[PDB]
Design a protein around this ligand. Structure first.
Ligand SMILES: O=C1c2cccc3c(NCCO)ccc(c23)C(=O)N1c1cccc(Br)c1
Length: 559
């Protein structure tokens, strides 16, 4: 069946859409080549529609069947419950898209009677009607990139806010337990950055002759079939659940997850979906489970030897024993053929990699540096082009969700975060006198709230004290950072050091928590380095809840 059909009505914008980065001294100081920066808009939505629209023809086999049987068996050990309305309301992000029934996220979070009564009506209707397709809106995402020597907007398909709160009531608890129960250490969202690094390193080290590859599924959401989605339901139903939950889960599956009508921002019928919805609660969990099942089966089909997989939604990395250079190539082609039969054909063809630093999982890779005691330390990093470009845009057009803050937390040990991002934004915070203000940010498909003054303890907790003293880094790493600074027209690293000396000084003179930020975050910037001791708050922080499966569209909030 076709992943989508289309009436010919356009994918329309809500309000205005800025395409280009403005020329402004506060962003220009970070990077000069503003003409290279663009935000996607609804103008390119028809180009994306063409790419995501195709027929799927899935053929399953015994390798698939046995993996699925193991998965359902594992799922049987899980017990889950319904959330109360109040609990689901608290999980709603403050800037979630408003309902068309006369309330928005603010009213959900405050438990306004209109919002709660509406949500109760939606829940009752899900108990009563297990079949009528539920309406969705289709929008073009506005996301910022640098031109690569312009990509079309991604599309997002989501139901009304009343429905989204109900999805959490039915499935949030399952989503906290099921992926780990069925995948164990292959479930990637359980790991903080350091934990991901440790898992990859140990997997790599466990092989005599390691070989790794990443598999890029072409438009994964579109390749998910109606049957894949019903199979996901059967995995949820293998858990021990209250009957009320079982009913609503089946209704959500039949009316929303397997497909439905799509409406544009103007209220015009736009198309019909028979694939994964990109903006539902289950998008991340479902993609993870289904990717895992297809991938592990394909490893068996291809003859991949002793696979260790890391799966994060549609993102897949597999580390195994090399069978020789020719044979590895043969085996990946066979892996690809099997994935293709399972309805997950490739974009980029997979290729065998024999150096861990060059393997990319979730646009990230492991690299190495030295700490202040001269010990080797490994850490997660990535190509800094997109983070810096988004930092520049968000400097002049503030976003409810601050990408730069999530990049600080996730990539704190990196040279590019420490020298450029931290320097740029702590300067801005001092200038606004808003150091002490909580800001929201995305992380693994969820939204969180952090006070910049707590960053030192947050970073020590996630990355260790070594995050404040890494040096020496690798040439791969430094080459990539240098190439990005040149491409964007950013000041060179030596200029960022000059700036950071001043930001550190200003932070220390503010005293209290600001001074801790100066001393710890910017110790790299001074000649006479301070001896950094463990921060007592760091040793008492519980940040496990930051690394969960998240939700389609990042539509979940923890506080
Ligand atoms: O402070 C610098 C630095 C300052 C100026 C230029 C460079 C540099 N430039 C050469 C080519 O871009 C390469 C690495 C570092 C660096 C470099 O690794 N460090 C550095 C040392 C310790 C911690 C941190 Br964070 C950065």
């Amino acid at each position: 069946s076709m992943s989508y059909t289309w009436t010919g009505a356009l994918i329309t914008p809500c309000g205005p859409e800025e395409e280009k980065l403005p020329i402004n001294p506060l962003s220009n100081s970070l990077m000069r080549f503003h003409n290279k920066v663009y935000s996607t808009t609804s103008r390119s939505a028809s180009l994306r529609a063409k790419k995501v629209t195709f027929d799927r023809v899935q053929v399953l086999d015994a390798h698939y069947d046995s993996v699925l049987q193991d998965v359902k068996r594992a799922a049987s050990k899980v017990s889950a419950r319904l959330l109360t309305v109040e609990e689901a309301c608290a999980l709603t992000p403050p800037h979630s898209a408003k309902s068309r029934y006369g309330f928005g996220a603010k009213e959900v979070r405050s438990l306004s009677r209109r919002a709660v009564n509406h949500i109760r009506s939606v829940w009752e209707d899900l108990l009563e009607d297990q079949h009528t397709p539920i309406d969705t809106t289709i929008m073009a995402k506005n996301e910022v990139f640098c031109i690569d020597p312009k990509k079309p907007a991604r599309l997002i398909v989501y139901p009304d806010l009343g429905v989204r709160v109900c999805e959490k009531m039915a499935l949030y608890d399952i989503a906290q337990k099921l992926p780990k129960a069925i995948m164990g250490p292959s479930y990637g969202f359980q790991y903080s950055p350091a934990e991901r690094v440790d898992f990859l390193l140990k997997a790599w080290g466990s092989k005599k002759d390691p070989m790794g590859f990443s598999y890029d599924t072409r438009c994964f959401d579109s390749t998910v079939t109606e049957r894949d989605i019903r199979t996901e339901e059967s995995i949820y139903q293998a858990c021990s659940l209250p009957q009320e939950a079982r009913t609503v889960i089946h209704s959500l599956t039949e009316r929303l997850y397997v497909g439905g009508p799509m409406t544009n921002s103007k209220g015009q019928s736009c198309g019909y979906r028979r694939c994964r919805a990109s903006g539902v609660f289950t998008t991340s969990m479902g993609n993870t489970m289904t990717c895992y099942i297809k991938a592990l089966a394909a490893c068996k089909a291809a003859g991949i030897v002793d696979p260790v997989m890391l799966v994060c939604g549609d993102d897949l990395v597999v580390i195994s024993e090399s069978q020789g250079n020719e044979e590895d190539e043969r085996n990946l082609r066979a892996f690809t053929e099997a994935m293709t039969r399972y309805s997950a054909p490739p974009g980029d063809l997979p290729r065998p990699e024999y150096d861990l630093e060059l393997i990319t999982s979730c646009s990230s890779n492991v690299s190495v540096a030295l700490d202040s005691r001269g010990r080797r330390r490994y850490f997660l990093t990535r190509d800094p082009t997109t983070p810096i470009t988004r930092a520049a845009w968000e400097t002049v057009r503030h976003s409810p969700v601050n990408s730069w803050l999530g990049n600080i937390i996730q990539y704190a040990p990196t040279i590019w975060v420490r020298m450029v991002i931290m320097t740029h934004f702590f300067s801005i915070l001092l200038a606004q006198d808003t150091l002490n203000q909580n800001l929201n940010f995305e992380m693994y498909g969820a939204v969180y709230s952090v006070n910049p003054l707590d960053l030192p303890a947050i970073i020590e907790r996630l990355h260790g004290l070594e995050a404040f003293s890494l040096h020496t880094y690798s040439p791969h790493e430094l080459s990539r950072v240098a190439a990005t600074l040149r491409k964007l027209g950013a000041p060179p690293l030596r200029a960022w050091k000059s700036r950071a000396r001043a930001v550190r000084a200003s932070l220390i003179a503010q005293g209290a928590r600001a001074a801790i930020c100066g001393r710890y975050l910017f110790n790299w910037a001074v000649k006479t380095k301070l001896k950094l001791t463990p921060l007592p708050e760091a040793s008492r922080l519980d940040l496990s809840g930051w690394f969960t499966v998240g939700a389609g569209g990042g539509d979940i909030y923890h506080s």
